[PDB]
Amino acid sequence: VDICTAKPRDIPMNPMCIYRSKIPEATNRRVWELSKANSRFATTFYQHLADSKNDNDNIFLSPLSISTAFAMTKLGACNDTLQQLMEVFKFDTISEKTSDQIHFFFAKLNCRLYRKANKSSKLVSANRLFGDKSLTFNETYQDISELVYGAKLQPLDFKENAEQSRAAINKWVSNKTEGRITDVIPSEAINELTVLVLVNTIYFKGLWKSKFSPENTRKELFYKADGESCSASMMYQEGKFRYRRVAEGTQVLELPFKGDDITMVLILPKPEKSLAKVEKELTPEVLQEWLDELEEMMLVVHMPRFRIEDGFSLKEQLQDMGLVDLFSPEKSKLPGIVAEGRDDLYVSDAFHKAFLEVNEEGSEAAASTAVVIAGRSLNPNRVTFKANRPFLVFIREVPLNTIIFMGRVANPCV
Numbered sequence: 530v531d532i533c534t535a536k537p538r539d540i541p542m543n544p545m546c547i548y549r550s551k552i553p554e555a556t557n558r559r560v561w562e563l564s565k566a567n568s569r570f571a572t573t574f575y576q577h578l579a580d581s582k583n584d585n586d587n588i589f590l591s592p593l594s595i596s597t598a599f600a601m602t603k604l605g606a607c608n609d610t611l612q613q614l615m616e617v618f619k620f621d622t623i624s625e626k627t628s629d630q631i632h633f634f635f636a637k638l639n640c641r642l643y644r645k646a647n648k649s650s651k652l653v654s655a656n657r658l659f660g661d662k663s664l665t666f667n668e669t670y671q672d673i674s675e676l677v678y679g680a681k682l683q684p685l686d687f688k689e690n691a692e693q694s695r696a697a698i699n700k701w702v703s704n705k706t707e708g709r710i711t712d713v714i715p716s717e718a719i720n721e722l723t724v725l726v727l728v729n730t731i732y733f734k735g736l737w738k739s740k741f742s743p744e745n746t747r748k749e750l751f752y753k754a755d756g757e758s759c760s761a762s763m764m765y766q767e768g769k770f771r772y773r774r775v776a777e778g779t780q781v782l783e784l785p786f787k788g789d790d791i792t793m794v795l796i797l798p799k800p801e802k803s804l805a806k807v808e809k810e811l812t813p814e815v816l817q818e819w820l821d822e823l824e825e826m827m828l829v830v831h832m833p834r835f836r837i838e839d840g841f842s843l844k845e846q847l848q849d850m851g852l853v854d855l856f857s858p859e860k861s862k863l864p865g866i867v868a869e870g871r872d873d874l875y876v877s878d879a880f881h882k883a884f885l886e887v888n889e890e891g892s893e894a895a896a897s898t899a900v901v902i903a904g905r906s907l908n909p910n911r912v913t914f915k916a917n918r919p920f921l922v923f924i925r926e927v928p929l930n931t932i933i934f935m936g937r938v939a940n941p942c943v
């Protein structure tokens with residue numbers, strides 16, 4: 530039956546290699562743990578990423594999507610490759626059983642995230658495997674991915690139609706993300722020696738609990754660091770919201786969607802202060818403190834009606850975060866993928882692309898993560914606009930305390 534009600538002993542799926550080792554009501558402790566882990570990676574990754582970008586740049590990702598995809602990749606890992614994945618993604622900072630049962634509890638967390646009855650806001654996810662038509666993949670490997678991640682294996686012809694296969698993958702990702710994410714894998718990323726491609730997609734579309742009125746939305750010039758300008762449709766509202774002015778005058782505002790199950794957190798540093806201090810001290814612990822301090826208050830909310838998108842490769846960051854072997858054609862270990870015992874597999878490169886849009890009605894967001902086993906290790910775009918005065922955005926799920934999307938909006942103009 531569905532793994533949303535099953536227990537580890539009901540369907541004890543056997544992974545390739547074994548790892549070398551209050552809370553909310555009606556919530557299984559271990560699922561809560563997984564949330565802590567994923568959040569511990571969310572914050573950490575952002576810090577490395579925000580470190581490799583100009584403070585006046587937009588940043589937008591879905592740590593959830595990245596974690597899900599890499600946990601999927603973890604099925605075929607083994608030895609030091611596996612040890613690295615566990616550590617980097619915080620899968621080792623939890624109890625023994627949960628650590629040794631990641632996939633199953635990820636299935637459970639996901640069940641809670643996307644299969645929750647009576648859903649006021651739309652949150653859906655889709656996973657998928659794309660493998661070369663000529664190879665013979667491990668049956669158990671497929672079965673477990675399909676069972677736990679709902680990721681079926683679609684055969685594509687990378688061997689002779691690499692580029693065409695790429696467009697196919699992207700078209701699938703667009704389909705799942707409502708046409709928001711249409712180009713996750715860059716051109717020439719996939720080539721003749723490509724074996725498999727693991728993909729995850731997350732899509733959120735909710736309505737504000739307290740919507741904004743378009744007759745109050747105005748326009749004003751936004752001044753960029755360089756000296757230029759652009760038009761920004763600044764939304765206005767007045768109502769009660771959980772707010773809190775913290776250390777050094779940093780404002781924290783929460784915008785709950787219909788149902789309060791999911792909410793948007795906005796962190797605005799002091800009127801003429803660097804967000805850098807905030808970002809550097811970003812820990813799930815601090816994030817929790819802020820939200821715990823928020824007190825429902827009456828206030829005037831001003832926020833731009835905008836749209837941002839951010840796409841990038843994950844290789845550089847993850848390596849600087851501990852993941853080395855997985856990308857090394859000499860030290861990588863992925864024995865549990867193809868039945869042919871081809872233990873020469875390595876992840877060539879990984880990509881991510883997110884989308885964010887906000888208006889008087891609500892906020893839409895989509896994200897994807899494409900992991901390519903064997904291919905073209907290219908270095909994507911190294912330049913994007915640097916506007917000015919950015920604020921941090923978080924799209925979290927209240928009960929599970931999970932960070933769905935997270936980023937920094939530096940350019941609100943469109």
Ligand SMILES: CO[C@H]1O[C@H](COS(=O)(=O)O)[C@@H](O[C@@H]2O[C@@H](C(=O)O)[C@@H](O[C@H]3O[C@H](COS(=O)(=O)O)[C@@H](O[C@@H]4O[C@H](C(=O)O)[C@@H](O[C@H]5O[C@H](COS(=O)(=O)O)[C@@H](OC)[C@H](OC)[C@H]5OS(=O)(=O)O)[C@H](OC)[C@H]4OC)[C@H](OS(=O)(=O)O)[C@H]3OS(=O)(=O)O)[C@H](OC)[C@H]2OS(=O)(=O)O)[C@H](OS(=O)(=O)O)[C@H]1OS(=O)(=O)O
Nearest residue numbers: 536537538539555556557558559560624625626627637641
């Ligand atoms: C070194 O020690 C470590 O390893 C050993 C060996 O494990 S091994 O099997 O891998 O070798 C561990 O010992 C095993 O673990 C036990 C455990 O409870 O964790 C036990 O597991 C099995 O039985 C438990 C209890 O079942 S019971 O229902 O009969 O009591 C079971 O856990 C329950 O799962 C429920 C669930 O539905 O998931 C929980 O319900 C709550 O959550 C649901 C929904 O959650 S979610 O949607 O958020 O996901 C909610 O419904 C909406 C409920 O609402 C009513 C919630 O209940 S409420 O009361 O909280 O409101 C139960 O409550 C939390 C929960 O009980 C704790 C477990 O399922 S699992 O947790 O999903 O795995 C089940 O797994 S099984 O498949 O293995 O059976 C094992 O007994 C068989 C036990 O093996 S033993 O017999 O050899 O000891 C060590 O665990 S522990 O330390 O002993 O706890 C482990 O240590 S640690 O990992 O370091 O902590």
Ligand SMILES: *[C@@H]1O[C@H](CO)[C@@H](O)[C@H](O)[C@H]1NC(C)=O
Nearest residue numbers: 543544545667669865867868
């Ligand atoms: C398939 O993977 C499983 C672990 O999930 C392992 O038991 C088995 O040896 C593998 N079979 C192969 C590579 O043919």
Ligand SMILES: *[C@@H]1O[C@H](CO)[C@@H](O)[C@H](O)[C@H]1NC(C)=O
Nearest residue numbers: 700701703704705706707708
């Ligand atoms: C995605 O494909 C399904 C059929 O599987 C169809 O219902 C839907 O309209 C498609 N969505 C797109 C192309 O955005």
